[PDB]
């Protein structure tokens, strides 16, 4: 049975025999205790030339974790050269799906740092966790909306409201999927209609545009049109272009 002493895990076994060392399997989960200090290893730890990672509690975990040379792939026990659980392996020019997150590894078996072009497409891997970015991020005062590392196109909700992430060469040679300046004009995209104010944000709720009434979904900013709609207790009929009757 292990007990934490001054923020350091020591495995004392049972009989009050004071200490042990080496690899240990405590309830399915595998630890390594420093040979000289008998402390549960924590973080990036080198053992006999082979690399390992342990969380703050000394529990070995598999995944893509940051080492002194960059994020390495500590892998199952039979992936590359009879490796062992949680050992870093050689992983060259290949994608890695892990917990429904994407990673890509370069020539020297390290995960990507931020922007990286892979065979024609432009991926952005989160510099913090090395995984392909998901959601709304801002790089160099440029806004994007990522899905699995690739900037998407469309009207998506952002930190300062709904932004129109346009394709490349739509506004000041913008990058593909980068948010642009879209002021005081409607937008038809994938059958849904939008309208953007002076701040380039798709309006929501009830908005009167040009002597006509519109209602835009709070969640997607899409204009309500095509038939009947029950916007909270009352029935309304919107036209095809979003004009209520």
């Amino acid at each position: 049975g292990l007990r934490t002493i001054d923020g350091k895990k020591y495995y004392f076994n049972t009989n009050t025999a004071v200490a042990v060392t080496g690899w240990q399997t405590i309830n399915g989960k595998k630890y390594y205790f420093n040979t000289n200090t008998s402390i549960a290893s924590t973080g990036y730890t080198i053992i006999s030339g082979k690399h390992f990672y342990f969380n703050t509690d000394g529990i070995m975990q598999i995944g893509v974790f940051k080492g002194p040379d960059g994020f390495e792939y500590f892998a199952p026990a039979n992936t590359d050269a009879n490796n062992i659980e949680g050992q870093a392996i050689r992983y060259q020019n290949r994608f890695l799906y892990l917990h429904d997150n994407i990673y890509y590894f370069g020539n020297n078996s390290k995960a990507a740092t931020g922007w990286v072009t892979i065979d024609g497409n432009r991926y952005y891997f989160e510099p913090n966790t090395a995984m392909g970015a998901n959601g709304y991020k801002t790089i160099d005062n440029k806004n994007f909306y990522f899905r699995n590392g690739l900037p998407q196109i469309g009207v998506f909700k952002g930190s300062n409201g709904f932004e129109y992430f346009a394709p490349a060469n739509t506004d000041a040679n913008n990058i593909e999927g980068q948010a642009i300046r879209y002021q005081n004009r409607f937008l038809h995209l994938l059958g849904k209609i939008y309208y953007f104010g002076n701040n380039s944000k798709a309006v929501t709720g009830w908005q009167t545009i040009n002597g006509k009434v519109y209602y835009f979904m709070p969640d997607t900013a899409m204009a309500a049109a095509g038939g009947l709609f029950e916007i909270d207790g009352v029935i309304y009929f919107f036209g095809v272009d979003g004009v209520k009757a």
Partner: antibody, heavy 117, light 105 residues
């Protein structure tokens, strides 16, 4: 210990394909499954692999947009799904097993996918 | 990065004679796996790591190399050994272009 794959499926450009791989004679969770195709007389091309235990998949950047590998432990079957087939996808797709991460110990007999209008 | 290259595209020898296959890499790699394929058959694993061979592989076939250059060699050819021989690096799972070993007559 043998692997047995599907039969020759034949599709038209833009469609998809399902190839299976029936692992036999061993513990399906122990090893990994690699998918490798071979265009007519061309060099062997590696597509992706899967780890049955943890649901870990890795692609080859060439097929990032279309290939997907899946897993059915109980059935001891490995799958790959090429989508949006180009006329240049006509190839023999193989299913191979990794021995402690060194080489391919067992190979399927290969599955022929023909793409053509 | 890593590109594997089969040094003799075709090699024409006779049975009973010693044969050499080379597979030179664009960079320094630790291990190299050698395979084999007959026409109409799936590739059969020949060598793995660099030296170590697989089951069902006679003691004819040897394997050795370091860094950039690796050599597959057959001590004494027998009529069955004539086929294509691919190399492979595992970490990138790239393959060579094959060397076709044909019967010289």
């Amino acid at each position: 210990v043998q692997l047995v794959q599907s039969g020759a499926e034949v599709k038209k450009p833009g469609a998809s394909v399902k190839v299976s791989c029936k692992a036999s004679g061993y513990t399906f969770t122990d090893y990994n499954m690699d998918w490798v195709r071979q265009a007519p007389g061309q060099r062997l091309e590696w597509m992706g692999d899967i780890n049955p235990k943890y649901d870990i998949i890795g692609h080859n950047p060439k097929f990032m947009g279309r290939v997907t590998i899946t897993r059915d432990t109980s059935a001891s079957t490995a799958y790959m799904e090429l989508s949006s087939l180009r006329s240049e996808d006509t190839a023999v797709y193989y299913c191979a097993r990794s021995d402690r991460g060194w080489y391919f110990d067992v190979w399927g007999q290969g599955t022929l996918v023909t793409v053509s209008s | 990065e890593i590109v594997l290259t089969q040094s003799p595209a075709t090699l024409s020898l006779s049975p009973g004679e010693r044969a050499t296959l080379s597979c030179r890499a664009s960079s320094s790699v630790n291990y190299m796996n050698w395979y084999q394929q007959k026409p109409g058959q799936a590739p059969r694993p020949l060598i793995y790591a660099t030296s170590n061979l697989a089951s069902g592989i006679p003691a004819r076939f040897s394997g050795s190399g370091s860094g950039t250059d690796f050599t597959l060699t057959i001590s004494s050819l027998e009529p069955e050994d004539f086929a294509v021989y691919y190399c492979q690096q595992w970490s990138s799972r790239t393959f060579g272009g094959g060397t076709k070993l044909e019967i010289k007559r």
